[PDB]
RNA sequence: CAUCGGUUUGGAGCGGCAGGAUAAUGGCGGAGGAAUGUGGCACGGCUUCUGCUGUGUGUUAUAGCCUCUGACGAUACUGCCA
RNA sequence: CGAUGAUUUUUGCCCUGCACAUUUUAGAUGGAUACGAAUAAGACUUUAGUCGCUGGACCAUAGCAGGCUGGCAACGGUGCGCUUAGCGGAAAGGCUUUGUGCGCUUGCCGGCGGAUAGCAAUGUCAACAUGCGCGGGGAUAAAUCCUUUGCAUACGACUUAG
């Protein structure tokens, strides 16, 4: 055999899902340059953006033709169910938990501390015998 | 952005002047800084150019008495110190106090061999230079200009890394055991409540 | 309670100044954890105390305080301008100040 | 111009197993193994199959594209070094003074000992690189055979032998004496 | 930051000539004050008219027809160097006709040190056919199934110090 | 304008400053580089300059006009009674240079070496090294612990030895104590050799053989304050020069408006530390030999 | 501390109105066209056709795109809000 | 800058435990939270899954600046004091560890206390240094002037001897 280690990059291709502004999802519909792409999405405005302003996700929207219009992008996004695919990843889960933590109140933080005390007691009890 | 009692920076892979300016402004603002592994610092530009630059620096000396002139320090830590001091009003009492807030070393001597070293992304060579550019390691320039203890430092750094590797293997084993204990106490009332809170 | 702090950590950085002339009547303060004028705008109007130690006792206490207040933001990285009852002495450059949470508007 | 993508295709013969991980190429063949580190170049590798490897440069400028086919050629030279070997033949050129060449061993090291070069009392010694074999040709008078798997070491040892026999303070157009590389081929004839 | 303007003007009517011909120009200007200034600059380069003897008739913004359709534009230029006057032709990929001109102005500033005052835009044409594309540096983006990664990603940090090793995966 | 003629400089800039040595005992700045494969042996010895003499020797130098022919040569006699080993020092390789880790001493020190640590011996209670001598109490485990530390951590091992100056005709009673680097063998071998040689005499015949080439470290003859003419070998000024002639006429150009460090000036001459190399050993004599 | 008055710096500020190609887009409907030709089909190299793939063909099929257009509905930008 | 010898029969010196009072502080106010290496690559958990896309993390965090008492569940956690063993010389002066004793435990539940500092005023709580009282262990010097020397020297200084 050969056993060549290949790069696991994310590629700039028609159908790549990207995060914009740490809030919204979008997909690449056509490549402008090494630096610029045309993006579209159900909850975003179809626009030409610089690749520095977006982050490629490991997700590809399969079978998206180059230059697809807003209707095609929305229809294929609904078919591929990109929102559910995103929401199941540890990245989106970490973002959601960060938001949830940011919405806690002082009383909820106090309760968090109390629950941490109880769980640490249980964890030490489990750890000493295992 | 937090204020730390001491910030210990691992100097490996850092560009000399960007780290120097950042550390100067940090110590001027009352922050204590320790820089370790100054022999692993980086300067942009090929090695020969920096050797020529250091020889231009060496050219400069007080004519009537060489003992009064610039003192060309050959150690990597002293090169970083010169870079920083050029960025400080060192002839005032305030600059003197700011410089007292700073320490620079070759290698990682005690007690810092068992403490946390951080990096400075705004000054990292691997993140700043274009991927084709050539760079210099300050340890090789120092040996090339008179620093005598390169092989002593590399012998002691290999010894430190052997001990530091044993540390990590112990920490990974105890981290694995605690995770198995945290897995047992999962799906408990505290864990379910902590999951609704985001923890 | 291992912690008892009721103030935000700050640092006395500088006076308001040009290249060569300094203005002691305005101090530049770095609030800990603040990195933008939007974050720093939460702290506008909050009173500031500089707490220091002195040789002579006053009413049995050797601790004296100079009080101030936040007036405006400064620049783009979350520094603020402060106005103290008595100007902060220049030797306090790099010394820590206390950013009080009052007058509170939460 | 920042060419968007440039590719080269390595071809791996049947008995050869290239092996690449983090720009460290280890080529294995019937004749042995050779290794080379490429951390000074920005290239990426894709295994098309067991007989072909794609070597790619993405968004590379003129010089960075130029550094791609040299990577291809170096790995190909490794492959033919581990499947056919390398052989350089040197001819001894002298007008009057015979060149006395011996293969000696001092201090546990192999050396090529050149004596009487242009009548000099000086004894020239060239260290023989590891993995390089020297032989005094029997079928040919005044011939040295330098052989080995690595083309770089063999050609550099040959160059060492050639460089140590330079003529000083004379018209080198007339005084053509020296030891020169006459043939650059392979151990296995083709 | 530019806009495309339609500026129409004419000579002031005389009793000899009461309806002078109306001339339109397409001007890429940041605002209408520079748009009407550039108009008179080129008419006095072509026609016997002045701002004192003329009249601006209309200024209207020309919006992109399909601002979210990726196009390739060919721009014909006439620029002044330190030594002479030269004609050049270049090609740009962008979604707006204006955005190709903004790249063009940045581009001739960077490779030829040509300032805005030294440049005349003769023509901007959208290349409908892929055979209309003459330049390689934009033709290389018209290949089928174009994919490429972005190796060596550098992440901008909000904090001065980071407690974990830097990475460039992407 | 330039000098009318180009002459070489007066004196060497590699022996500045021409000041007095900090100590009268010359100190070995650098020792021979250590080779593990050699046997454990000393690299230095201390002696006293007795005087000069003359020898006659048949020369063995092919191609010389004096080959196999008698030559008359000046020679120097160095009185070298055996030295006594009293201590050992360990040195550790550090990123700041060699650093002394520990010094271990012998149980008994002779009076001549205990006088080394005193300026007024006759007025003293002579308390030096008495508690340390007590450190050897019935098990001497403190000494063994320090020696094990030296074996474990030291990279350079040097012995401490003193001359037996009471065997010389000098009226001085203070011995001269110096560190002599130990070369050969492992660190453990050096430490065992040093410990086993405590309170023992070591002779010159165990350090130097005949026909060897050795170096000499010493402080030269003092001459006190000297003028430039003899201190630096400068040209005497003409006989008819006002205010004297044993001077340097021009001590600098107008600019730099300072006196340069390279100009010859009057000052203290001699009593300098010098290292002189490649002196051949014609004879290692023995005091017990009647010939 | 509260409230006021004068001056002033702001907010991820909120709302109403007007203008423009009575924005241009986009979405929906209809008509036409091409290729960086989708499905299909025909030859191949590796696949027990395991996003197989290359090339040819051709015009919506098991993707789509471009142009024109018909009736609505928005938004950007900019002004004004006593 | 290091190693090492000796350190005032003085009410003087060293080490140490407590206790107190002072001067100083370039500026405590939960925690300086320890692999290495690469980056056209990496981690983890077994070449395949997961991870990153920042520390908005992790640990710690409840109790008159944290009081007085009582009870369960567990046999854990932690502070301090002896104590066991091992490792660390790059500036180790720290990192572990055995047994034991005295506390606390907020893992959970009870009973009692805080007011008046009056609507804020740092509303005083830390470590470095020095001195002083006790208690305990411990040791009991030199250098200079002077005379002398001449390996030295203008005088200081230097090599000697007393
Ligand atoms: N699943 C829908 C698919 O639509 C595709 O076909 C699409 C195109 O061929 C067709 O072309 C354009 C379209 O791009 C554009 N966005 C709208 C325009 N009205 C369409 O035009 C065409 O389709 C419409 C019906 O939609 C017809 O009324 C009209 O006559 C025809 N020229 O619009 C169709 C629908 O968007 C597939 N080729 C077809 O096999 C399939 O039905
Ligand atoms: Mg620790
Ligand atoms: Mg030097
Ligand atoms: Mg204080
Ligand atoms: Mg010549
Ligand atoms: Mg000639
Ligand atoms: Mg690192
Ligand atoms: Mg002259
Ligand atoms: Mg030396
Ligand atoms: Mg010690
Ligand atoms: Mg010690
Ligand atoms: Mg004299
Ligand atoms: Mg004399
Ligand atoms: Mg004289
Ligand atoms: Mg005269
Ligand atoms: Mg006079
Ligand atoms: Mg008002
Ligand atoms: Mg007001
Ligand atoms: Mg409107
Ligand atoms: Mg429309
Ligand atoms: Mg068409
Ligand atoms: Mg097809
Ligand atoms: Mg409309
Ligand atoms: Mg409308
Ligand atoms: Mg508006
Ligand atoms: Mg208004
Ligand atoms: Mg006090
Ligand atoms: Mg990593
Ligand atoms: Mg994991
Ligand atoms: Mg693994
Ligand atoms: Mg594995
Ligand atoms: Mg994997
Ligand atoms: Mg963490
Ligand atoms: Mg932790
Ligand atoms: Mg209790
Ligand atoms: Mg218990
Ligand atoms: Mg100590
Ligand atoms: Mg110590
Ligand atoms: Mg600890
Ligand atoms: Mg107050
Ligand atoms: Mg108190
Ligand atoms: Mg208290
Ligand atoms: Mg004297």
From TrEMBL, chain A:
Single GO molecular function = structural constituent of ribosome
Q: Name one GO cellular component term.
A: cytosolic large ribosomal subunit
> Per its UniProt entry, which superkingdom is the organism in?
Eukaryota
Ranges for domain Large ribosomal subunit protein eL14: 45-120
Tell me the keywords, alphabetical order: Cytoplasm, Metal-binding, Ribonucleoprotein, Ribosomal protein
Q: Where in the cell is it found?
A: Cytoplasm
Q: Name one GO biological process term.
A: translation
Offer one Pfam family short name for this entry.
Answer: Ribosomal_L14e
Annotated InterPro entries: Rib_uL2_dom2 (IPR014722), Ribosomal_eL14 (IPR039660), Ribosomal_eL14_dom (IPR002784), Translation_prot_SH3-like_sf (IPR008991)
Give the principal location in a single coarse category: cytoplasm
Instruction: Report residues binding Mg(2+).
Output: 40, 44
Its function? Answer: Component of the ribosome, a large ribonucleoprotein complex responsible for the synthesis of proteins in the cell. The small ribosomal subunit (SSU) binds messenger RNAs (mRNAs) and translates the encoded message by selecting cognate aminoacyl-transfer RNA (tRNA) molecules. The large subunit (LSU) contains the ribosomal catalytic site termed the peptidyl transferase center (PTC), which catalyzes the formation of peptide bonds, thereby polymerizing the amino acids delivered by tRNAs into a polypeptide chain.
UniProt record similarity statement: Belongs to the eukaryotic ribosomal protein eL14 family.
What is the official name of this protein in its record?
A: 60S ribosomal protein L14-B
Biological source species:
Candida albicans (Yeast)
Q: Gene encoding this polypeptide?
A: RPL14B
UniProtKB/TrEMBL annotation, chain B:
> Does Hydrolase appear among the keywords?
no
**Which Pfam families does this entry report, sorted A to Z?**
Ribosomal_L13
**GO terms of molecular function:** metal ion binding; mRNA binding; structural constituent of ribosome
Which of this chain's residues are annotated to bind Mg(2+) 1? 86
**The keyword Isomerase is annotated on this UniProt entry:** no
PROSITE patterns in the record: RIBOSOMAL_L13 (PS00783)
- The residues the record assigns to binding Mg(2+) 2 are 113-114
Location(s) in or outside the cell? Cytoplasm
What CDD domains does the annotation carry?
Ribosomal_L13
Positions the record marks as coiled coil are none
> Which key words are in the record?
Cytoplasm, Metal-binding, Ribonucleoprotein, Ribosomal protein
Q: Which GO terms describe its cellular component?
A: cytosolic large ribosomal subunit
Gene3D superfamilies, per the entry: 1.20.5.4280, Ribosomal protein L13
Biological process annotations from GO: negative regulation of translation; translation
Q: Superkingdom, according to UniProt?
A: Eukaryota
State the family it belongs to.
Belongs to the universal ribosomal protein uL13 family.
Question: What role does this protein play?
Answer: Component of the ribosome, a large ribonucleoprotein complex responsible for the synthesis of proteins in the cell. The small ribosomal subunit (SSU) binds messenger RNAs (mRNAs) and translates the encoded message by selecting cognate aminoacyl-transfer RNA (tRNA) molecules. The large subunit (LSU) contains the ribosomal catalytic site termed the peptidyl transferase center (PTC), which catalyzes the formation of peptide bonds, thereby polymerizing the amino acids delivered by tRNAs into a polypeptide chain.
Q: Which PANTHER family match?
A: LARGE RIBOSOMAL SUBUNIT PROTEIN UL13, RIBOSOMAL PROTEIN L13
Task: Specify the protein name.
Answer: Ribosomal protein L13
What is the originating organism of this protein? Candida albicans
Q: What is the lineage of its organism?
A: Eukaryota, Fungi, Dikarya, Ascomycota, Saccharomycotina
TrEMBL record, chain C:
Provide a GO CC annotation, any one: ribonucleoprotein complex
Q: Which residues bind Mg(2+) 1?
A: 84
Q: Which residues bind Mg(2+) 2?
A: 85
One Pfam family name is Ribosomal_L35Ae
The biological process GO terms on file are:
translation
Record's keyword terms, sorted: Metal-binding, Ribonucleoprotein, Ribosomal protein
Q: Which GO terms describe its molecular function?
A: metal ion binding; structural constituent of ribosome
Provide the binding site for Mg(2+) 3: 87
> Sorted alphabetically, which PANTHER family does this protein's record hold?
60S RIBOSOMAL PROTEIN L35A (PTHR10902)
Family from the record: Belongs to the eukaryotic ribosomal protein eL33 family.
| Protein name per the record | 60S ribosomal protein L33-A
Species of origin reads Candida albicans
From TrEMBL, chain E:
Span of domain Large ribosomal subunit protein eL20: 2-124
Q: Which GO terms describe its cellular component?
A: ribonucleoprotein complex; ribosome
A biological process from GO: translation
Keyword check for RNA-binding:
no
Q: Which InterPro entries match?
A: Ribosomal_eL20, Ribosomal_eL20_dom, Ribosomal_eL20_eukaryotes
Q: What does UniProt give as the signal peptide span?
A: none
Q: Where does Mg(2+) bind?
A: 107
Q: Which Pfam families match?
A: Ribosomal_L18A
| Highest rank taxon of the organism | Eukaryota
Alphabetically, the GO molecular function entries are:
metal ion binding; structural constituent of ribosome
Q: Which UniProt keywords apply?
A: Metal-binding, Ribonucleoprotein, Ribosomal protein
Query: Which PANTHER family does the record associate with it?
Result: 60S RIBOSOMAL PROTEIN L18A
Q: Which family does it belong to?
A: Belongs to the eukaryotic ribosomal protein eL20 family.
Protein name as annotated: 60S ribosomal protein L20
Gene that this sequence comes from: RPL20B
């Amino acid at each position: 055999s050969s056993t060549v280690k290949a790069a696991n990059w994310r590629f700039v291709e028609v159908g790549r899902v990207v995060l914009v502004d740490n809030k919204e999802l979008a997909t690449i519909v056509e490549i402008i340059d090494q630096k610029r792409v045309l993006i579209d999405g159900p909850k975003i405005q179809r626009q030409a953006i610089a690749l520095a302003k977006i982050v490629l996700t490991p997700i590809v929207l399969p079978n998206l033709p180059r230059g697809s219009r807003t209707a095609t992008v929305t229809k294929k996004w609904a078919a591929a169910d990109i929102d559910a695919k995103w929401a199941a990843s540890g990245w989106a889960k970490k973002l959601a938990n960060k938001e949830r933590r940011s919405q806690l109140s002082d009383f909820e933080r106090f309760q968090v501390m109390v629950l941490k005390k109880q769980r640490r007691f249980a964890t030490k009890k489990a750890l000493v015998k295992a | 952005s937090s204020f730390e009692k001491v910030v210990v920076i691992d100097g490996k892979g850092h560009l000399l002047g960007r780290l120097a300016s950042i550390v100067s402004k940090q110590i001027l603002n009352g922050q204590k800084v320790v820089v370790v592994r100054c022999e692993e610092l980086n300067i942009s530009g090929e090695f020969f150019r920096n050797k020529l630059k250091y020889h231009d620096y060496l050219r400069k000396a007080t004519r009537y008495n060489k003992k009064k002139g610039p003192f060309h320090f050959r150690a990597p830590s002293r090169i970083l110190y010169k870079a920083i001091r050029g960025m400080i009003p060192h002839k005032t009492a305030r600059g003197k106090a700011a410089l007292e807030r700073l320490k620079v070393f070759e290698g990682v001597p005690p007690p810092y061999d068992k403490k946390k070293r951080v990096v400075v992304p705004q000054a990292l060579r691997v993140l700043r230079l274009k991927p084709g550019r050539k760079y210099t390691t300050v340890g090789k320039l120092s040996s090339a200009v008179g620093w005598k203890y390169e092989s002593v430092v590399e012998k002691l750094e290999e010894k430190r890394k052997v001990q530091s590797a044993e540390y990590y293997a112990k920490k990974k084993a105890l981290t694995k055991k605690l995770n198995a204990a945290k897995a047992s106490t999962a799906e408990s009332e505290a864990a379910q409540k902590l999951a609704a809170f985001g923890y | 309670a291992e912690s008892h702090r009721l103030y935000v950590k700050g640092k006395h950085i500088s006076y308001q100044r040009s290249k060569s002339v300094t203005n002691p009547n305005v101090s530049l303060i770095q609030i800990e954890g603040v990195a933008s004028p939007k974050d720093a705008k939460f702290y506008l109007g909050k009173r500031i105390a500089y707490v220091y130690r002195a040789p002579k006792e006053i009413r049995g206490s050797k601790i004296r305080v100079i009080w101030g207040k936040v007036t405006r933001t400064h620049g783009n990285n979350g520094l603020v301008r402060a106005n103290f009852k008595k100007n902060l002495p220049p030797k306090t450059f790099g010394a820590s100040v206390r950013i009080m949470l009052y007058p509170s508007n939460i | 111009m920042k060419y968007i993508q440039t590719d080269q295709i390595l071809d791996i013969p049947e008995g050869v197993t290239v092996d690449i991980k983090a720009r460290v190429v280890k080529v294995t063949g019937p004749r042995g193994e050779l290794t080379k580190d490429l951390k000074h170049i920005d290239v990426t590798f894709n295994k098309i199959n067991n007989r072909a490897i794609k070597i790619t440069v993405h968004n590379g400028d003129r010089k960075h594209v130029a550094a791609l086919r040299t990577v291809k050629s170096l790995i190909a030279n490794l492959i033919t070094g581990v499947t056919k070997g390398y052989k350089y033949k040197m001819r001894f050129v002298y007008a009057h003074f015979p060149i006395n060449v011996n293969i000696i061993k001092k201090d546990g090291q192999d050396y090529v000992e050149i004596r009487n070069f242009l009548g000099e009392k000086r004894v020239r010694e060239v260290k023989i690189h590891e993995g390089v074999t020297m032989e005094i040709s029997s079928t040919q008078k005044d011939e040295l055979i330098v052989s080995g798997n690595s083309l770089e070491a063999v050609s550099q040892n040959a160059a060492d032998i050639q460089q140590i026999c330079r003529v000083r303070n004379k018209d080198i157009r007339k005084f053509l004496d020296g030891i020169y590389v006459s043939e650059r081929g392979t151990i296995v004839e083709e | 930051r530019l806009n495309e303007y339609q500026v129409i003007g004419r000579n002031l009517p005389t009793e000899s000539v009461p309806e002078p011909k109306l001339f339109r120009m397409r001007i890429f200007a940041p605002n209408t004050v520079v748009a009407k200034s550039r108009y008179w600059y080129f008419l006095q380069k072509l026609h016997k008219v002045k701002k004192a003897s003329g009249e601006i008739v209309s200024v209207n913004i020309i919006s992109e027809a399909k601002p979210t359709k990726v196009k390739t534009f060919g721009i014909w230029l006439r620029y002044e160097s330190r030594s002479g006057i030269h004609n050049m032709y270049k090609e740009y990929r962008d979604v707006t006709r204006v955005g190709a001109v903004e790249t063009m102005y940045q581009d001739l500033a960077a490779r030829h040190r040509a300032r805005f005052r030294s440049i005349h835009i003769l023509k901007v044409v959208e290349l409908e056919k892929t055979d209309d594309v003459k330049r390689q540096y934009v033709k290389q983006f018209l290949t089928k199934d174009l994919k490429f990664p972005l190796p060596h990603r550098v992440q901008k940090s909000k904090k001065l110090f980071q407690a974990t090793a830097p990475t460039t995966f992407y | 304008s330039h000098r009318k003629y180009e002459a070489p400089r007066h004196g060497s800039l590699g022996f500045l400053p021409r000041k007095r040595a900090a100590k009268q005992r010359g100190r070995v700045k650098s020792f021979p580089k250590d080779v593990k494969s050699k046997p454990v042996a000393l690299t230095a010895f201390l002696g006293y300059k007795a005087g000069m003499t003359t020898i006659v020797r048949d020369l063995d130098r092919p191609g010389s006009k004096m080959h196999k022919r008698e030559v008359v040569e000046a020679a120097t006699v160095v009185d070298t009674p055996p030295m006594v080993v009293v201590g050992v020092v360990g040195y550790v390789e550090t990123p700041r240079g060699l650093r002394s880790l520990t010094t271990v001493w012998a149980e008994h020190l002779s009076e001549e070496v205990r006088r080394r640590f005193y300026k007024n011996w006759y007025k003293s209670k002579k308390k030096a090294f008495t508690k340390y001598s007590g450190k050897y109490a019935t098990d001497a485990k403190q000494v063994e612990t320090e020696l094990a530390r030296i074996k474990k951590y030291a990279s350079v091992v040097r012995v401490l030895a003193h001359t037996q100056i009471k065997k010389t005709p000098l009226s001085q009673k203070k011995a001269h104590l110096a560190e002599i680097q130990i070369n050969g063998g492992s660190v453990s071998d050096k430490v065992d050799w040093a410990k086993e040689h405590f309170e023992k005499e070591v002779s010159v015949d165990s350090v130097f053989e005949q026909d060897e080439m050795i170096d000499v470290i010493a402080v030269t003859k003092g001459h006190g304050f000297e003028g430039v003419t003899h201190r630096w070998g400068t040209k005497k000024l003409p006989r008819k020069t006002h205010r004297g002639l044993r001077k340097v006429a021009c001590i600098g150009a107008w600019h730099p408006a300072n006196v340069n460090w390279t100009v010859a000036r009057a000052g203290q001459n001699g009593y300098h530390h010098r290292t002189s190399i490649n002196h051949k050993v014609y004879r290692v004599g023995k005091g017990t030999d009647e010939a």
